[PDB]
Amino acid sequence: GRYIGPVCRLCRREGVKLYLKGERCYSPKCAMERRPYPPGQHGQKRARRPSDYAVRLREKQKLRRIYGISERQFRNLFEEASKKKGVTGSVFLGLLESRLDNVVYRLGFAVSRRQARQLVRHGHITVNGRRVDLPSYRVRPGDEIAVAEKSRNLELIRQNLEAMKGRKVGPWLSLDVEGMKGKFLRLPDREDLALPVNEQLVIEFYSR
Amino acid sequence: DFEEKMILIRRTARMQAGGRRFRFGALVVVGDRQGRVGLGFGKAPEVPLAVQKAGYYARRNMVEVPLQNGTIPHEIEVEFGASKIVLKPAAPGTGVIAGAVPRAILELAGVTDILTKELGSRNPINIAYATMEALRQLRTKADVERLRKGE
Amino acid sequence: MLTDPIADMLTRIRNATRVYKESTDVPASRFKEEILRILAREGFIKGYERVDVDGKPYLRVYLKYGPRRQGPDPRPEQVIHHIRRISKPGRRVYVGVKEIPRVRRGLGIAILSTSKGVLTDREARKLGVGGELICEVW
Amino acid sequence: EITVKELLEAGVHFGHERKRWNPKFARYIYAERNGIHIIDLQKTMEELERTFRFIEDLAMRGGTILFVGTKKQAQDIVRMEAERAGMPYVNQRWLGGMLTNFKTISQRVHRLEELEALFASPEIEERPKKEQVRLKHELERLQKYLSGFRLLKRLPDAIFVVDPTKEAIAVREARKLFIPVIALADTDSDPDLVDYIIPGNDDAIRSIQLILSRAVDLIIQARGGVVEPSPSYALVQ
RNA sequence: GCCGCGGUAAUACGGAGGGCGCGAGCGUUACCCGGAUUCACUGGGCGUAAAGGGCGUGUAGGCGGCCUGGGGCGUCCCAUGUGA
RNA sequence: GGAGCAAACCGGAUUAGAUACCCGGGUAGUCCACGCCCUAAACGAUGCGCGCUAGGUCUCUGGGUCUCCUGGGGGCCGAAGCUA
RNA sequence: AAAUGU
Ligand SMILES: [Mg+2]
Ligand SMILES: [Mg+2]
Ligand SMILES: [Mg+2]
Ligand SMILES: [Mg+2]
Ligand SMILES: [Mg+2]
Ligand SMILES: [Mg+2]
Ligand SMILES: [Mg+2]
Ligand SMILES: [Mg+2]
Ligand SMILES: [Mg+2]
Ligand SMILES: [Mg+2]
Ligand SMILES: [Mg+2]
Ligand SMILES: [Mg+2]
Ligand SMILES: [Mg+2]
Ligand SMILES: [Mg+2]
Ligand SMILES: [Mg+2]
Ligand SMILES: [Mg+2]
Ligand SMILES: [Mg+2]
Ligand SMILES: [Mg+2]
Ligand SMILES: [Mg+2]
Ligand SMILES: [Mg+2]
Ligand SMILES: [Mg+2]
Ligand SMILES: [Mg+2]
Ligand SMILES: [Mg+2]
Ligand SMILES: [Mg+2]
Ligand SMILES: [Mg+2]
Ligand SMILES: [Mg+2]
Ligand SMILES: [Mg+2]
Ligand SMILES: [Mg+2]
Ligand SMILES: [Mg+2]
Ligand SMILES: [Mg+2]
Ligand SMILES: [Mg+2]
Ligand SMILES: [Mg+2]
Ligand SMILES: [Mg+2]
Ligand SMILES: [Mg+2]
Ligand SMILES: [Mg+2]
Ligand SMILES: [Mg+2]
Ligand SMILES: [Mg+2]
Ligand SMILES: [Zn+2]
């Protein structure tokens, strides 16, 4: 199944923090803070100039490693995107973001997408009143994601739900913090998040 | 200001009585990503001086690159020696579909959406020198009527 | 003999242009005519004049160019950057009104013989015809 | 006035060459008599008319013109002129790079000036008899190839040629640098590579001295004072 | 897989540590298309790189100059059926 | 038919050897008629015909109001252009 | 007269 194990090695290697843990990857020490250099014996050594391929490679993984999914599931979406209308590329992020488990991270019901997933998988999450246990669900506008009844309580939700009081959730997002529910509003334009990534290259990569 | 970029370094070697002496060659692109690109070729006893004088030589053969939002006004194909480059426009959200030599130019002239092929001798040097000559022969619907007139 | 006269015309021009001359004389036809015409109507040429030479009719075709550029080789840009026969006696090219060129993205112009005559890509599309593609020019 | 009419064109300034010619020299040709090609002067002046219409505007805004001519037919004529116009010139023999590598050759006139700083300076005697002549020998050559080039401290904005055939080197150097090219040319060379032309005998002092002497007068007449007729018809003829 | 690595200091063998890449999959072999514009209609060549017939005459065949008619075969348009 | 020449053949030299090179000999063949064979660096290593695109010089051969012009050949250098 | 060199 998914990637499991050493994560903080990945806020690094890619050479850029990508907030993959809970509070740690947000706390003074995200595998990069202390050691902002690539993993393994050859860490504190001077890099040689990457290949153009290498450059494109690292950029893709980064993005995937951010959303944290199989190369299987990942590329389908690219080709799907690659097939569609006009920009037929940048739209990609929209398809990535429509993932249930992705959304739940943004909706602050959890902090790691990894934590998000275990919820959806354990089916602590519902959509439009439906017990939905599938982290791949491409959600759409006006769909509603809320905690189920057997789990409205649960220590893990409350604090995770609470700490959200502070920030303006995504333009495409909305949250009844007390009501434990959110609405997918719209398709996040490229504007709506300057990811640390240059998606232009992922395209360039996948056209091998 | 400008945006340098080498796409080629190489080590030639003449020969002398006892041993072979060397020289290094460097091909640098220099752009603005706004429609201005240049290209010169550096040859010097050691590496960086060439690279340096490449970028010197580069900022000469500059070129109006009359974009039409991240693309070219029309399709062009040019032949340099026995090397051949095909330039084809593209609707936005396409990509810069090119080898490593020409994409290391079209980007620095702007161009976010273009289709390309190399044909004949894929030698980078003579390929580079070609592509420039393609841009230099780009003409705009504006550029044309200036000619298809009277007096 | 001349297997193809139309090609010979185009080729005569292309030869003349590359040395930047005033005029270019070429044997006459009512079909070579309404083929030129466009080249004035689209302003690829100044124009022509039906004349006679040594008792025999020709069509002095007057060449446009551009600005005396500067730098080494001050020779001006051409008006006619490119021109080549398409349909030939060795292989005749016919097209439906759909299957019709977008020469140099609108900047270029095809020339075709049709059920209404020497149209262009633009025209033949709008009249809704298509026919024997003679040549492409830009 | 400012100008000259075809009655003055009676020296040689009609043509003198033929068959040793470039056919580019069409239009500015009249007919072939005595085998020699002859060129109409209606156009010669018409060109001068056009040509001078670019010289004055250039001169009267205080530009600079470099003078080139290595023909023994036109050596000294230009020297006087460009001195009589206080302008730089190349009488002697032309050097590659001079414009395209201007910056580099320019450091050689400094040495000339740097040398001249040792004529009566307090170190001449204080440098041995041996070297004393060597530098003086190094001097006398330096001045020869840099006299009319010692003037100017930056590339001009036009250059005047007595025969663009020969100084095509210079013409190429100039042309590569968007530098306006003007020339007295006969059937020898050829137009196109010229921006402003004096189609006439580019040999036989008459045409040269005629058009060259008068050319200078045009400059002053846009700088201040066309003083007495400069030397000419001395041993000249 | 090709270019090639091993001759007492091997990032190329063998193990180890570490790293890259996929993940209930990862490799390999065989085969088809791509890249190959390397059968080239789109879209190539034949002086010295492989390629002009040793040279004529000529059958079928391919191709054909300038003008005006008739025919409308090709070609072009429209409509319609068919194209499961 | 056969003078001269000359594969093969013999001899003299050279050489380690010399079935070669150089030398003295020498038969087919070389020449004629008739009939076969059909190869080649059979080369401009460039197929044929027509049209178009600067000139300079040397020459062979026609015609011209014989400078010069023009026609058809045989070479050189060369505009533009082509070419690795 | 005058050969050869994992
Ligand atoms: Mg698309
Ligand atoms: Mg080629
Ligand atoms: Mg190849
Ligand atoms: Mg290669
Ligand atoms: Mg050991
Ligand atoms: Mg060892
Ligand atoms: Mg070793
Ligand atoms: Mg290996
Ligand atoms: Mg190993
Ligand atoms: Mg290990
Ligand atoms: Mg390992
Ligand atoms: Mg073909
Ligand atoms: Mg080929
Ligand atoms: Mg051929
Ligand atoms: Mg061979
Ligand atoms: Mg061969
Ligand atoms: Mg042959
Ligand atoms: Mg044959
Ligand atoms: Mg045969
Ligand atoms: Mg026949
Ligand atoms: Mg027929
Ligand atoms: Mg016919
Ligand atoms: Mg149908
Ligand atoms: Mg004998
Ligand atoms: Mg013997
Ligand atoms: Mg013996
Ligand atoms: Mg023995
Ligand atoms: Mg013998
Ligand atoms: Mg052969
Ligand atoms: Mg031939
Ligand atoms: Mg044949
Ligand atoms: Mg004859
Ligand atoms: Mg005669
Ligand atoms: Mg001839
Ligand atoms: Mg030649
Ligand atoms: Mg030339
Ligand atoms: Mg042996
Ligand atoms: Zn971390």
mmCIF file of N, CA, C and O (backbone and C1' of nucleotides) in Angstrom, chain F residues 38-66:
data_model
loop_
_atom_site.group_PDB
_atom_site.id
_atom_site.type_symbol
_atom_site.label_atom_id
_atom_site.label_comp_id
_atom_site.label_asym_id
_atom_site.label_seq_id
_atom_site.Cartn_x
_atom_site.Cartn_y
_atom_site.Cartn_z
ATOM 1 P P C F 38 29.165 -12.603 -72.858
ATOM 2 O "O5'" C F 38 29.855 -11.171 -73.070
ATOM 3 C "C5'" C F 38 30.494 -10.478 -71.987
ATOM 4 C "C4'" C F 38 30.079 -9.024 -71.947
ATOM 5 C "C3'" C F 38 28.562 -8.811 -72.076
ATOM 6 O "O3'" C F 38 27.984 -7.895 -71.091
ATOM 7 C "C1'" C F 38 29.722 -7.642 -73.825
ATOM 8 P P U F 39 28.810 -6.753 -70.272
ATOM 9 O "O5'" U F 39 29.763 -7.580 -69.325
ATOM 10 C "C5'" U F 39 30.258 -6.995 -68.144
ATOM 11 C "C4'" U F 39 31.757 -7.057 -68.079
ATOM 12 C "C3'" U F 39 32.433 -5.812 -67.562
ATOM 13 O "O3'" U F 39 32.318 -5.676 -66.162
ATOM 14 C "C1'" U F 39 33.614 -6.645 -69.432
ATOM 15 P P A F 40 31.637 -4.362 -65.544
ATOM 16 O "O5'" A F 40 32.823 -3.330 -65.639
ATOM 17 C "C5'" A F 40 34.065 -3.671 -65.069
ATOM 18 C "C4'" A F 40 35.131 -2.682 -65.418
ATOM 19 C "C3'" A F 40 34.711 -1.235 -65.524
ATOM 20 O "O3'" A F 40 34.492 -0.641 -64.247
ATOM 21 C "C1'" A F 40 36.256 -1.802 -67.242
ATOM 22 P P A F 41 33.665 0.734 -64.101
ATOM 23 O "O5'" A F 41 34.805 1.825 -64.264
ATOM 24 C "C5'" A F 41 35.748 2.052 -63.228
ATOM 25 C "C4'" A F 41 36.641 3.202 -63.574
ATOM 26 C "C3'" A F 41 37.728 2.901 -64.601
ATOM 27 O "O3'" A F 41 37.889 4.031 -65.446
ATOM 28 C "C1'" A F 41 38.692 3.810 -62.675
ATOM 29 P P A F 42 37.707 3.878 -67.025
ATOM 30 O "O5'" A F 42 36.412 2.944 -67.135
ATOM 31 C "C5'" A F 42 35.104 3.496 -67.192
ATOM 32 C "C4'" A F 42 34.558 3.454 -68.597
ATOM 33 C "C3'" A F 42 33.110 3.896 -68.783
ATOM 34 O "O3'" A F 42 32.960 5.312 -68.799
ATOM 35 C "C1'" A F 42 33.519 1.912 -70.017
ATOM 36 P P C F 43 31.809 6.028 -67.918
ATOM 37 O "O5'" C F 43 32.617 7.191 -67.184
ATOM 38 C "C5'" C F 43 32.700 8.493 -67.751
ATOM 39 C "C4'" C F 43 33.773 9.312 -67.096
ATOM 40 C "C3'" C F 43 35.179 9.073 -67.631
ATOM 41 O "O3'" C F 43 35.910 10.295 -67.596
ATOM 42 C "C1'" C F 43 35.130 8.605 -65.325
ATOM 43 P P G F 44 35.670 11.414 -68.728
ATOM 44 O "O5'" G F 44 35.125 12.656 -67.876
ATOM 45 C "C5'" G F 44 36.022 13.506 -67.162
ATOM 46 C "C4'" G F 44 35.366 14.158 -65.964
ATOM 47 C "C3'" G F 44 34.791 13.199 -64.913
ATOM 48 O "O3'" G F 44 34.958 13.778 -63.616
ATOM 49 C "C1'" G F 44 33.115 14.665 -65.638
ATOM 50 P P A F 45 35.710 12.982 -62.431
ATOM 51 O "O5'" A F 45 34.973 11.574 -62.414
ATOM 52 C "C5'" A F 45 33.719 11.417 -61.762
ATOM 53 C "C4'" A F 45 33.067 10.114 -62.141
ATOM 54 C "C3'" A F 45 31.687 9.872 -61.555
ATOM 55 O "O3'" A F 45 30.933 9.059 -62.450
ATOM 56 C "C1'" A F 45 33.253 8.317 -60.643
ATOM 57 P P U F 46 30.226 9.708 -63.744
ATOM 58 O "O5'" U F 46 29.291 10.840 -63.107
ATOM 59 C "C5'" U F 46 27.933 10.561 -62.765
ATOM 60 C "C4'" U F 46 27.126 11.824 -62.568
ATOM 61 C "C3'" U F 46 26.792 12.600 -63.850
ATOM 62 O "O3'" U F 46 25.544 13.279 -63.681
ATOM 63 C "C1'" U F 46 27.978 13.987 -62.400
ATOM 64 P P G F 47 24.147 12.588 -64.112
ATOM 65 O "O5'" G F 47 24.287 12.448 -65.696
ATOM 66 C "C5'" G F 47 24.682 11.222 -66.294
ATOM 67 C "C4'" G F 47 23.574 10.622 -67.125
ATOM 68 C "C3'" G F 47 22.769 11.589 -67.975
ATOM 69 O "O3'" G F 47 23.442 11.979 -69.161
ATOM 70 C "C1'" G F 47 21.303 10.088 -66.878
ATOM 71 P P C F 48 23.362 13.502 -69.683
ATOM 72 O "O5'" C F 48 21.935 13.553 -70.402
ATOM 73 C "C5'" C F 48 21.570 12.588 -71.382
ATOM 74 C "C4'" C F 48 20.135 12.758 -71.826
ATOM 75 C "C3'" C F 48 19.672 14.183 -72.063
ATOM 76 O "O3'" C F 48 20.102 14.706 -73.308
ATOM 77 C "C1'" C F 48 18.025 13.006 -70.830
ATOM 78 P P G F 49 20.381 16.281 -73.462
ATOM 79 O "O5'" G F 49 18.907 16.878 -73.479
ATOM 80 C "C5'" G F 49 18.023 16.552 -74.532
ATOM 81 C "C4'" G F 49 16.654 17.136 -74.314
ATOM 82 C "C3'" G F 49 16.593 18.604 -73.917
ATOM 83 O "O3'" G F 49 16.781 19.487 -75.010
ATOM 84 C "C1'" G F 49 15.141 17.355 -72.544
ATOM 85 P P C F 50 17.433 20.938 -74.768
ATOM 86 O "O5'" C F 50 16.251 21.733 -74.032
ATOM 87 C "C5'" C F 50 15.015 21.980 -74.699
ATOM 88 C "C4'" C F 50 14.003 22.703 -73.823
ATOM 89 C "C3'" C F 50 14.482 23.935 -73.063
ATOM 90 O "O3'" C F 50 14.627 25.091 -73.867
ATOM 91 C "C1'" C F 50 13.175 22.603 -71.631
ATOM 92 P P G F 51 15.650 26.254 -73.423
ATOM 93 O "O5'" G F 51 14.882 26.987 -72.231
ATOM 94 C "C5'" G F 51 13.580 27.531 -72.404
ATOM 95 C "C4'" G F 51 12.984 27.959 -71.078
ATOM 96 C "C3'" G F 51 13.825 28.911 -70.234
ATOM 97 O "O3'" G F 51 13.779 30.256 -70.664
ATOM 98 C "C1'" G F 51 13.052 27.176 -68.860
ATOM 99 P P C F 52 15.113 31.148 -70.616
ATOM 100 O "O5'" C F 52 15.258 31.500 -69.064
ATOM 101 C "C5'" C F 52 14.451 32.502 -68.460
ATOM 102 C "C4'" C F 52 14.397 32.341 -66.964
ATOM 103 C "C3'" C F 52 15.637 32.778 -66.200
ATOM 104 O "O3'" C F 52 15.723 34.180 -66.001
ATOM 105 C "C1'" C F 52 15.007 30.645 -65.452
ATOM 106 P P U F 53 16.990 35.000 -66.570
ATOM 107 O "O5'" U F 53 17.980 35.071 -65.322
ATOM 108 C "C5'" U F 53 17.557 35.569 -64.062
ATOM 109 C "C4'" U F 53 18.525 35.181 -62.968
ATOM 110 C "C3'" U F 53 20.007 35.309 -63.306
ATOM 111 O "O3'" U F 53 20.504 36.632 -63.192
ATOM 112 C "C1'" U F 53 19.620 33.206 -62.314
ATOM 113 P P A F 54 21.057 37.414 -64.490
ATOM 114 O "O5'" A F 54 22.478 36.742 -64.758
ATOM 115 C "C5'" A F 54 23.442 36.630 -63.727
ATOM 116 C "C4'" A F 54 24.225 37.904 -63.559
ATOM 117 C "C3'" A F 54 25.213 38.244 -64.669
ATOM 118 O "O3'" A F 54 24.605 38.823 -65.813
ATOM 119 C "C1'" A F 54 26.264 38.525 -62.575
ATOM 120 P P G F 55 25.433 38.955 -67.194
ATOM 121 O "O5'" G F 55 26.658 39.902 -66.799
ATOM 122 C "C5'" G F 55 27.850 39.938 -67.576
ATOM 123 C "C4'" G F 55 29.028 40.360 -66.739
ATOM 124 C "C3'" G F 55 30.407 40.105 -67.344
ATOM 125 O "O3'" G F 55 30.836 41.130 -68.227
ATOM 126 C "C1'" G F 55 30.348 39.233 -65.152
ATOM 127 P P G F 56 31.837 40.782 -69.443
ATOM 128 O "O5'" G F 56 33.187 40.388 -68.697
ATOM 129 C "C5'" G F 56 33.935 41.352 -67.977
ATOM 130 C "C4'" G F 56 35.231 40.770 -67.475
ATOM 131 C "C3'" G F 56 36.070 40.041 -68.513
ATOM 132 O "O3'" G F 56 36.848 40.910 -69.310
ATOM 133 C "C1'" G F 56 35.874 38.687 -66.595
ATOM 134 P P U F 57 37.061 40.588 -70.868
ATOM 135 O "O5'" U F 57 38.180 39.450 -70.845
ATOM 136 C "C5'" U F 57 39.398 39.631 -70.130
ATOM 137 C "C4'" U F 57 40.110 38.319 -69.906
ATOM 138 C "C3'" U F 57 40.362 37.476 -71.147
ATOM 139 O "O3'" U F 57 41.485 37.906 -71.887
ATOM 140 C "C1'" U F 57 39.491 36.104 -69.438
ATOM 141 P P C F 58 41.522 37.704 -73.478
ATOM 142 O "O5'" C F 58 41.787 36.138 -73.629
ATOM 143 C "C5'" C F 58 43.041 35.573 -73.261
ATOM 144 C "C4'" C F 58 43.087 34.074 -73.490
ATOM 145 C "C3'" C F 58 42.622 33.574 -74.847
ATOM 146 O "O3'" C F 58 43.559 33.787 -75.888
ATOM 147 C "C1'" C F 58 41.692 32.212 -73.177
ATOM 148 P P U F 59 43.039 34.079 -77.388
ATOM 149 O "O5'" U F 59 42.477 32.663 -77.862
ATOM 150 C "C5'" U F 59 43.292 31.499 -77.836
ATOM 151 C "C4'" U F 59 42.468 30.240 -77.976
ATOM 152 C "C3'" U F 59 41.738 30.067 -79.290
ATOM 153 O "O3'" U F 59 42.589 29.624 -80.326
ATOM 154 C "C1'" U F 59 40.325 29.452 -77.475
ATOM 155 P P C F 60 42.222 29.926 -81.853
ATOM 156 O "O5'" C F 60 41.127 28.810 -82.185
ATOM 157 C "C5'" C F 60 41.463 27.427 -82.173
ATOM 158 C "C4'" C F 60 40.268 26.550 -82.472
ATOM 159 C "C3'" C F 60 39.409 26.962 -83.651
ATOM 160 O "O3'" C F 60 39.962 26.586 -84.892
ATOM 161 C "C1'" C F 60 38.027 26.384 -81.829
ATOM 162 P P U F 61 39.748 27.516 -86.176
ATOM 163 O "O5'" U F 61 38.186 27.408 -86.434
ATOM 164 C "C5'" U F 61 37.599 26.164 -86.744
ATOM 165 C "C4'" U F 61 36.101 26.263 -86.778
ATOM 166 C "C3'" U F 61 35.524 27.413 -87.573
ATOM 167 O "O3'" U F 61 35.605 27.237 -88.973
ATOM 168 C "C1'" U F 61 34.367 27.245 -85.542
ATOM 169 P P G F 62 35.255 28.464 -89.952
ATOM 170 O "O5'" G F 62 33.691 28.634 -89.745
ATOM 171 C "C5'" G F 62 32.997 29.689 -90.366
ATOM 172 C "C4'" G F 62 31.528 29.617 -90.082
ATOM 173 C "C3'" G F 62 30.760 30.890 -90.354
ATOM 174 O "O3'" G F 62 30.446 31.060 -91.714
ATOM 175 C "C1'" G F 62 30.247 30.181 -88.208
ATOM 176 P P G F 63 31.093 32.284 -92.519
ATOM 177 O "O5'" G F 63 29.995 33.427 -92.327
ATOM 178 C "C5'" G F 63 28.614 33.149 -92.528
ATOM 179 C "C4'" G F 63 27.722 34.073 -91.725
ATOM 180 C "C3'" G F 63 28.066 35.554 -91.764
ATOM 181 O "O3'" G F 63 27.654 36.211 -92.948
ATOM 182 C "C1'" G F 63 27.749 34.937 -89.543
ATOM 183 P P G F 64 28.577 37.367 -93.580
ATOM 184 O "O5'" G F 64 28.169 38.658 -92.732
ATOM 185 C "C5'" G F 64 26.814 39.082 -92.640
ATOM 186 C "C4'" G F 64 26.568 39.917 -91.398
ATOM 187 C "C3'" G F 64 27.330 41.230 -91.300
ATOM 188 O "O3'" G F 64 26.763 42.274 -92.075
ATOM 189 C "C1'" G F 64 27.480 40.099 -89.243
ATOM 190 P P U F 65 27.643 43.048 -93.186
ATOM 191 O "O5'" U F 65 28.981 43.454 -92.399
ATOM 192 C "C5'" U F 65 28.944 44.178 -91.168
ATOM 193 C "C4'" U F 65 28.910 45.670 -91.384
ATOM 194 C "C3'" U F 65 29.416 46.526 -90.227
ATOM 195 O "O3'" U F 65 30.834 46.634 -90.186
ATOM 196 C "C1'" U F 65 27.347 47.372 -90.973
ATOM 197 P P C F 66 31.599 46.853 -88.782
ATOM 198 O "O5'" C F 66 33.132 46.898 -89.220
ATOM 199 C "C5'" C F 66 33.717 45.828 -89.961
ATOM 200 C "C4'" C F 66 34.187 44.719 -89.053
ATOM 201 C "C3'" C F 66 35.578 44.152 -89.366
ATOM 202 O "O3'" C F 66 36.299 43.920 -88.152
ATOM 203 C "C1'" C F 66 33.944 42.411 -89.400
#
